[PDB]
Amino acid sequence: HSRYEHIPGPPGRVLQDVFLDWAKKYGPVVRVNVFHKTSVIVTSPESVKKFLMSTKYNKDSKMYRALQTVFGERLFGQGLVSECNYERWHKQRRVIDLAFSRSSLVSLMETFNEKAEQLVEILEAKADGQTPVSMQDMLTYTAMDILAKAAFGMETSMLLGAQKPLSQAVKLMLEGITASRNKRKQLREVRESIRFLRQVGRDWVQRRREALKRGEEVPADILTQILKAEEGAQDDEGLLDNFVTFFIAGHETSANHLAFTVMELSRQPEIVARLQAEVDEVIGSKRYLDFEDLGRLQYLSQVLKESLRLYPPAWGTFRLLEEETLIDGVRVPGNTPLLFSTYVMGRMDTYFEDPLTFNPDRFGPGAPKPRFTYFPFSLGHRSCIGQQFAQMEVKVVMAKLLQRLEFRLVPGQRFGLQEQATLKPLDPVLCTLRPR
Numbered sequence: 001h002s003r004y005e006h007i008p009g010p011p012g013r014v015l016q017d018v019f020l021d022w023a024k025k026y027g028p029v030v031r032v033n034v035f036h037k038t039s040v041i042v043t044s045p046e047s048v049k050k051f052l053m054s055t056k057y058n059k060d061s062k063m064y065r066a067l068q069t070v071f072g073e074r075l076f077g078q079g080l081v082s083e084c085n086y087e088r089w090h091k092q093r094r095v096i097d098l099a100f101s102r103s104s105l106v107s108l109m110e111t112f113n114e115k116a117e118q119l120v121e122i123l124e125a126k127a128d129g130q131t132p133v134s135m136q137d138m139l140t141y142t143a144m145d146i147l148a149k150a151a152f153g154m155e156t157s158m159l160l161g162a163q164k165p166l167s168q169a170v171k172l173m174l175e176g177i178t179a180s181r182n183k184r185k186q187l188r189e190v191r192e193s194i195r196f197l198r199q200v201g202r203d204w205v206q207r208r209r210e211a212l213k214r215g216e217e218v219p220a221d222i223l224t225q226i227l228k229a230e231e232g233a234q235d236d237e238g239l240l241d242n243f244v245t246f247f248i249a250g251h252e253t254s255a256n257h258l259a260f261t262v263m264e265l266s267r268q269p270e271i272v273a274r275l276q277a278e279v280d281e282v283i284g285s286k287r288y289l290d291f292e293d294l295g296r297l298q299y300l301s302q303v304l305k306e307s308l309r310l311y312p313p314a315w316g317t318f319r320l321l322e323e324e325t326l327i328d329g330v331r332v333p334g335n336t337p338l339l340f341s342t343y344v345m346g347r348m349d350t351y352f353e354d355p356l357t358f359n360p361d362r363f364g365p366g367a368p369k370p371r372f373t374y375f376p377f378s379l380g381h382r383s384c385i386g387q388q389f390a391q392m393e394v395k396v397v398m399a400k401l402l403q404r405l406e407f408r409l410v411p412g413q414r415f416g417l418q419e420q421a422t423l424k425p426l427d428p429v430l431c432t433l434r435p436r
């Protein structure tokens with residue numbers, strides 16, 4: 001008699017689609033196997049509210065092992081995403097929060113604008129209606145160049161075709177996370193890629209420390225606060241865990257969200273005409289979007305919320321259930337990982353009418369707000385520290401694309417998903433482009 005046997009469950013697609021099928025068939029508490037562990041997927045809004053909105057429930061560290069270390073190489077270690085002890089998390093969260101204040105983020109608008117403008121100019125030169133362009137690749141290069149400058153004061157210049165070894169290292173590390181949760185050459189390429197990313201942190205931290213000593217210019221950035229959180233530490237391993245955490249987390253989900261949005265909008269010509277009209281009316285001929293302009297792009301804000309409902313790059317989270325608890329009529333044993341999924345809840349007709357329809361008007365003013373059914377940045381104390389940074393950067397990039405260019409998805413390109421650390425388009429989002 002297995003400890004989970006009594007829980008309801010089974011006797012371009014991802015595992016999350018299988019979980020969706022099972023939540024619909026077996027109800028709000030279902031036993032699954034994920035990251036090699038038995039867990040329970042909990043899909044009632046009452047459960048999302050109870051477990052995400054209380055500091056009583058902490059993240060289940062077992063479900064973060066493949067971010068902490070891959071194939072025996074330390075990756076994110078005990079950085080801000082993967083630290084599951086409340087007190088150790090809270091200390092670093094409150095120091096790093098200062099880099100995400102309103103004043104800190106408004107000062108990044110110049111960087112967001114400059115990299116968005118550079119992308120647009122590169123794309124405008126290819127806008128012949130014939131040359132295929134990977135929007136997944138171009139949006140990833142743009143997100144990387146933004147993050148490296150905004151967070152670290154470094155110029156990666158991926159939009160100029162630079163840092164190819166770094167681009168390969170990130171790709172192989174993301175494949176390593178995926179393989180670890182589900183040979184000789186794979187192990188070697190993944191392990192060397194993780195060590196490369198930590199050595200980039202060593203190199204960049206040494207550059208920052210030399211700049212501070214020589215009395216050169218250093219703007220207050222995320223790296224300032226990562227350093228501050230480690231003041232008086234025994235070694236640099238905590239520093240490098242947060243360096244790699246922010247270097248990867250600060251670009252990959254943003255790129256995924258951009259690529260999903262461009263992909264979906266390629267089959268939504270009326271919505272695109274509305275977004276083009278909105279950018280035309282709000283920013284006009286301006287080459288630079290001001291902070292005050294972002295809040296005026298209200299239809300774009302709704303489109304991006306709807307993109308996250310259907311295509312959340314980070315599908316959810318886990319909490320550790322410490323004691324046996326009744327969850328929606330089901331007895332869940334103590335020491336169980338509870339899986340929460342914004343991907344699954346977003347596709348359930350219980351929670352969203354016509355869930356596969358892309359309808360920005362779900363997020364219109366005076367529309368009833370989703371109540372614990374929608375959480376692409378999670379909820380509660382472990383919600384995304386980067387949520388407003390991401391929302392600002394992606395609005396800037398999308399507004400500049402919409403101002404200047406028309407995109408058509410190359411026929412044959414698919415709308416399917418893949419999972420490698422995060423959810424992202426299976427295909428490269430190959431488009432042809434024309435100037436507006």
Ligand code: HEM
Nearest residue numbers: 080081249250253254257314317377378382384385386390
């Ligand atoms: C559209 C883009 C993004 C999405 C969808 C997203 C999503 C999420 C989600 C779902 C979580 C909770 C993860 C968990 O419970 O294990 C999270 C946490 C986090 N994200 Fe993001 N994120 C985005 C952008 C960013 C950016 C831009 C940064 C950094 C600049 C970032 C850094 C982090 C960190 C460090 C955490 C851990 C926060 C904590 O536990 O205190 N994210 N994000």
Ligand SMILES: O=C(C1CCN(c2cncnc2-c2ccc(F)cc2)CC1)N1CC(F)C1
Nearest residue numbers: 063248249250252253314316317318421422
């Ligand atoms: O692994 C994950 C998530 C992966 C996405 N995370 C991010 C959050 N915000 C920005 N970026 C990321 C990022 C991107 C690339 C990456 F390799 C790791 C992290 C949050 C954690 N778990 C949640 C549990 F179910 C296990």
